[PDB]
Design a protein around this nucleic acid. Structure first.
Lengths: 73, 102, 69, 90, 95, 77, 103, 89, 95, 77, 78, 96, 102, 90
DNA sequence: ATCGAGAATCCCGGTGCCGAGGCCGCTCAATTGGTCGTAGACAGCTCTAGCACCGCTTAAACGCACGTACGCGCTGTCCCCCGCGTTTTAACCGCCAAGGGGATTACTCCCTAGTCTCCAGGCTCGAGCTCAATTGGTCGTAGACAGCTCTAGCACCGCTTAAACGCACGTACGCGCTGTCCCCCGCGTTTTAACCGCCAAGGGGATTACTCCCTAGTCTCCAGGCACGTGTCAGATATATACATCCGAT
DNA sequence: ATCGGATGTATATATCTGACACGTGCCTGGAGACTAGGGAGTAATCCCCTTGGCGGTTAAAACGCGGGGGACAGCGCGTACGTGCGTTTAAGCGGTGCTAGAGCTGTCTACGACCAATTGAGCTCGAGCCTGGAGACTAGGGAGTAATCCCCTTGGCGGTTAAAACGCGGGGGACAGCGCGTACGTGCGTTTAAGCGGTGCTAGAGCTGTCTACGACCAATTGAGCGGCCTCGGCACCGGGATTCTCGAT
């Protein structure tokens, strides 16, 4: 895994808190969430890179991400 | 009828029969087809509402597929639900990218 | 808490995606994208948890959430 | 051949009393109802399986609605369904 | 009289986004459909509404694909779509 | 060679609905290939369903199921 | 008064007893042994004849023939087991076609 | 030349008063009775030999019947034999 | 008129399982019995009922063997009995 | 004399056994099988005949042979 | 539930000695049923002999005799 | 790492177990089976050790032979995997 | 002894006693136990000969059940005679079906 | 006092394989075998005598019984052995 | 870039009618209530565990000056290449004509049950015998009575050898498709077994003189069986040696 | 398919020891002459009919001979099911240390069954009756086979809105080319945290009881849906305006 464990955990607890109070988490639930987020970002960065090369660039920009996400739906 | 007891327009009995014969589960609660019929009725009413609105904006009293496409695509949440759905004879929304105009 | 996904972490993820150079404005955008994704997945996961009358989100709930999108 | 056409037409008169609907549009509405039926019933079945429950009740339907519908659509549908089930129980 | 390059294209854009009529000729598409189906199993027949359905699906797919190609073209600060735009659109869709 | 019935002007109309003003000459043949691939994939699934039902007539429902199972659900048939 | 009559039997207790003495089975035979054996033989004969009579009546014949014996024996699981390696002369076989052969 | 024909016929008259039997069927019944006789007597003989016993009794016959007859046939045969020995005694 | 392959076969199966008459001709079987016997003992004679006994036994054996052969053929998802079926049936019977 | 067990007789025997279709090779094969059976039974039968110092094989001898080969026959006692 | 003592690896070993190379998962339960029937049939006969001798201990000879009368004669325990 | 292809170890095991003679079912669980089944016929029975060993010899010989016949049935159907229908054919033709 | 008079190793007197006490017939001829001893001796000699041969093939000096099973099953006529016989601790003959080999 | 064939089997073994021994299990199998064949031959001879309304089992019934029970070439040798033995004994 | 004129393209308004929509109606069939239970489905309670909450640590992660070479956006020219008018050309649509199935209907043929007539096949009436019942004395075989001494069962304990539970994952079963084969249905042919009759004696089947084969009881003399001291091939501990077998590489 | 190397296996081999033949002491039931006892199979002898051999006839069936279809041996691809591996756990096992039910044998005794007349009785074979299933026929129903059907297929050419295509030509896009600036290392300080511990505790996964709700029939049914018909909203066409680009200018 490529994101540091503890900040991701804290983010998960913070984000989860605005939906239901007093939640706890299994450890394997957080590793599952980490696998899912990192897989998504790697794939999204793959799509951004294809969009960048399409525009004859090598530098990724926000507009590449928004195009990739728009075409993904 | 059960629909009248539940205050609904969609046919609870019919929905119940389709749930029974769709091989969805071994047992079916009494409230499930009522709830399902109510939800289907609600979504039908919303799409028909927006499509009617579009129809009156175009000064047409009859709903045609075009109004369904306009209604669905101009509403973010309906567009999300039918993001991978084709409305036959719906066409598309008029939209030209600003950089292409003279 | 979104700021805990640090600049070097996003850099490591970009390297794994094969990206060699990254604009300074990418970082905030990635954070936003991450927040949206996480929000959506957890919303489904917690919905499943509530159905099970549990207070603990389990690994199967998250995996199931991933499957349905 | 059964369909939801007449119920859709009555709903149309509730929401637009002097408005009609073409045959193609009614066919699209019927397709719509069948799609949402399959999505909600199938997902509810999956929830019940997930929870080792053999019966689909209004709770699985409600949770499926919350997963499938966005924001205000999910809340409004849940409110209408809840009112309907409580009125039915009485 | 002569319209400048692009004016008639835009006029055509306004015309075809306004309407809903099918854009491929019915009969040549029908021959295509029967040929492809025949190359899987011989002597099949088709109901008319099956061909109409297939045509709606193909045209909807192509219009959406051309939408994505246009987004890819504008992204590259171009106005002319080229095969690499199609390749990128379909790669990002996952086709 | 029935793929040639998807004519150059027809592809132009299709591109127009997508908002395209100018089209390189090579798009049409590329488009043709792409369209053919899509159709094969849809028709293949449809015919598979037809074969499971032991029928000789591909029905609208067969096609609808094929589109649904490829993630391209179609409304109205 | 015969011993078979005292035992309530139709099969010949005396004959079975003599046949036991002369069959070189043992040096001595108890008095109850041929009664028991005759009773068992009579029971089995009666059971088979019962079924064969039923089969005969289904076939509207008043005389039992070997065909009815074959039907009686092979359609009864325990009699068929007892006579698993027995050929009933002029019996034929049971009508039976494996499902895969039917159209 | 001995046979069981008259006894088979008496049993038939007990169970089906108005039913007859063909010559071949009666011959098959005689073969059957002789067969079961041989089976039961032989098994009883082996039981007696195995146990170093010189006498075949109703008990040897009964055990042989349990060995040879399946299930309900065995139970009913034992019942008929026991009833017959008690009536004889 | 012509019956399809199998219809008449089934009719014959029902016919011959309904009846009980011997199915091999008397005189050739007798000739076979005398031929085989001659290679074991000279000057043998035969009672008529001995030959009839042999016919009942052989035909019962063959019908049963053909039953088992059919079960073995069906096991292999066929409906036609073949020599390998006979040899398998006889091997499992222990012959 | 083995050819006297004719083709239609073997077909009829198979019909009683429930067989619907018969490979052409069954007949010769069946004949071989038949021959073996007869030999075995008769070998025992003739021995019985020889034991009795008789010159006529009787039906009883055959029945005894069948019994001793595990193929007990009823009706010829 | 002692029939479960006839384990999956035991059935594999028996099949290997029988020359079997590949074994469907359903064979084992099927085999167990078959085995139980066999034992029942044998033990039934054995117990009859035990009961006939007015003994309370099933002997090796009872089993050998049961097998013989069931056409599965066993050498070596006389 | 090394891995033998499917079947090589099966064949090796076949050779191994056809070479040897030791009983292949565990002694004590089989013994429990015998005592349970017998107890369901007559309560409080005892068994001589050699009686149980006799039962073990008989059962293993019967099953090994039955598995031989099942294998022959499999080969007849151009398969190499024995299936329940193979057992049922073998036992039907044997007359059990 | 009668065995010596007949040139046999198996006990003619004992076989005679077993015939007398086996309840086979009321009388037994004088030649019968000699013949029986001779037949038993011949078959014993054949099995022991072949089993010894098998034992030597395995470089063993003592016959164990494996050699008897090999001897019996590898001889067509002995295998036929003992077709329905179980040899305790015999195992089976090595034999792998050709279709199962790689 | 339990009688058996062990010593006679062993004498035959020394005749056929002078330097070969035999295990106890194998001797038990030989004894079981001899008893089995004894039972088979005696039973067939008894039945033979009965079938022919004879009260005496002679070497003739034994020989024919042997011919029924033993296969082929084994039968010819066994008949030969029996005949030589009976003629030497007489 | 923002006037001004001018034409094209489209929009609007007004109308024609027709057909797609609205609407009734007969029905008919999918729908709803009365009654039974079987639970599945939820409520209460409990031991556990893993999950939240908290202190060092050192160290790797991160965060922050620096500067810099690596793009990237922004213009410039070229040329390049694809769209628009005009025109011609035409398959496609119009729009029609005829042949054309999937199908059970509506006919057709042979199979399989009902209906008198005539016997071979058992169904009854009388005739002289081999099989069956009695008790008696007379043996024996079997069944209680009583040991008694063993081995079959009951509990403790390493421990390891095997059994159980995942874990890739790759051959196996299988399954639809397909070409040729090869065998079942139908019919003329040409046998050749079934039906029938003839004569006979060879051998089955009794009948008896008989003599010689094997049982039965007793005894003298015994090999074969029960114990029983002991080197040994057999069983188990290390070995090297190919012997196979699995993964590059012809 | 093989030529080889790398490991995991039995093989051919060397060593140590150990219950097992195993050869031995000896002890007793079993055995085999023996002489008859008598009772059974042997061997003429003699008669009666059963199975042949054969003459002889006929019409049922076998036997070729085609036709065709439908079956079987392949085959290529799907998917998936059991396997070989490894690790961890569970119970089988060798070793006790017992212990009391029951197999085994010995007394003895008292039932029990069998030739032996012996007294007699059903059984079985003639002999002569009928009469019930073959049979010989009939009739209706089993099925197969075309085969018209209204509705959907296949083919088809005239006129005409659509497709080429060509020339033009005028705007993209692509590369050159650059200048700035900004992320990327690059190095130093920090600071936050994995991990190692440790604590208490909530909830959760499970277990048990039980009961409220839904399935699940039947009979009763009225609302939906085809069928049909009535109808006016708007698809399409004629006449006139908004807008809408488009060129020149400066």
């Amino acid at each position: 895994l490529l994101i540091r464990k503890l900040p991701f955990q804290r983010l998960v607890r913070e984000i989860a808190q605005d939906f239901k109070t007093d939640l706890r988490f299994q450890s394997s639930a957080v590793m599952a969430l980490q696998e899912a987020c990192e897989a998504y970002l790697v794939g999204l960065f793959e799509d951004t890179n294809l969009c960048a090369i399409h525009a004859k660039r090598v530098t990724i920009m926000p507009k590449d991400i928004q195009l990739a996400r728009r075409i993904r739906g | 009828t059960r629909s009248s007891r539940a205050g609904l327009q969609f046919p609870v009995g019919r929905v119940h029969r389709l749930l029974r014969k769709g091989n969805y589960s071994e047992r079916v609660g009494a409230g499930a087809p009522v709830y399902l019929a109510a939800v289907l009725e609600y979504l039908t009413a919303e799409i028909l509402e927006l499509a009617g609105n579009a129809a009156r904006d175009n000064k047409k009293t009859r709903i045609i597929p075009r109004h369904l496409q306009l209604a669905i695509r101009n509403d973010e949440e309906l567009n999300k639900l039918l993001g991978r759905v084709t409305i036959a004879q719906g066409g598309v929304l008029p939209n030209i990218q600003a950089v292409l105009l003279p | 808490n979104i700021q805990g996904i640090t600049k070097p972490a996003i850099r490591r993820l970009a390297r794994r995606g094969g990206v060699k150079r990254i604009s300074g404005l990418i970082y905030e955008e990635t954070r936003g994208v991450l927040k949206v994704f996480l929000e959506n997945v957890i919303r489904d996961a917690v919905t499943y948890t509530e159905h099970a009358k549990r207070k603990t989100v389990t690994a199967m709930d998250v995996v199931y959430a991933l499957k349905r999108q | 051949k059964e369909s939801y056409s007449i119920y859709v037409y009555k709903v149309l008169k509730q929401v637009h009393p002097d408005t009609g609907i073409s045959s193609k549009a009614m066919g699209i509405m019927n397709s719509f109802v069948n799609d949402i039926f399959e999505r909600i019933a199938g997902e509810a079945s999956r929830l019940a399986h997930y929870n080792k429950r053999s019966t689909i009740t209004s709770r699985e339907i409600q949770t499926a609605v919350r997963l499938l519908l966005p924001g205000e659509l999910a809340k409004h549908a849940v409110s209408e369904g809840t009112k309907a089930v409580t009125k039915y129980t009485s | 009289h002569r319209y400048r390059p692009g004016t008639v294209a835009l006029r055509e854009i306004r015309r075809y986004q306004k309407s809903t009529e099918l854009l491929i000729r019915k009969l040549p598409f029908q021959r295509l459909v029967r040929e492809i189906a025949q190359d899987f199993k011989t002597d099949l027949r088709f109901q008319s509404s099956a061909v109409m359905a297939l045509q709606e699906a193909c045209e909807a797919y192509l219009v959406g694909l051309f939408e994505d190609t246009n987004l890819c073209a504008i992204h590259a600060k171009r106005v002319t779509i080229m095969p690499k735009d199609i390749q990128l659109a379909r790669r990002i869709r996952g086709e």
